[PDB]
């Protein structure tokens, strides 16, 4: 009788604090960030799905995400994106 709806707000805010310790963000702005995150999520995942299909693969590995990033993101943003993704994943698999 409530209907709780999800959002990335909690996370944007944590990242906002690492880059700008004491800066705030209005809700209109936070709304725009959620949009952004979902847009890119959708885009990455979409291209990824297509990549798997073109190759007869039934599963999406972090390898699909990576090529996807290379196709979707522009030059320097891609480098940085890819680096941090690989970092997160190799760190993850080290339990």
């Amino acid at each position: 009788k409530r209907s709780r709806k999800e959002s990335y707000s909690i996370y944007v805010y944590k990242v906002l604090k690492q880059v700008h310790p004491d800066t705030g963000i209005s809700s209109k702005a936070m709304g725009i960030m959620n949009s952004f995150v979902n847009d890119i999520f959708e885009r990455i995942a979409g291209e990824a799905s297509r990549l798997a299909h073109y190759n007869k693969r039934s599963t999406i590995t972090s390898r699909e995400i990576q090529t996807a990033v290379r196709l979707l993101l522009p030059g320097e943003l891609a480098k940085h994106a890819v680096s941090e993704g690989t970092k997160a994943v190799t760190k993850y698999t080290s339990a």
Binding site: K28, G31, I32, S35, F36, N38, D39
Partner: protein, 84 residues
Amino acid sequence: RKVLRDNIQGITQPAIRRLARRGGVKRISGLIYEETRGVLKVFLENVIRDAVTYTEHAKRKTVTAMDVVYALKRQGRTLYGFGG
């Protein structure tokens, strides 16, 4: 309610001129106002036609902010700020 008619003329020159100033236009031919209205109406009908189509497929009598956001995306005018 009350018959809605000729509402495109509600988009006045002052406003069409303010939008052009943000577009950085310095001088405006008097024939521009009727062009804009025409263009605006064609743009709006398309976004609105797709939206209401989404509204009808979801079987509702209300056009939601999302119905529009999806309409805009279908048309390549992706909008950030109202959900989605």
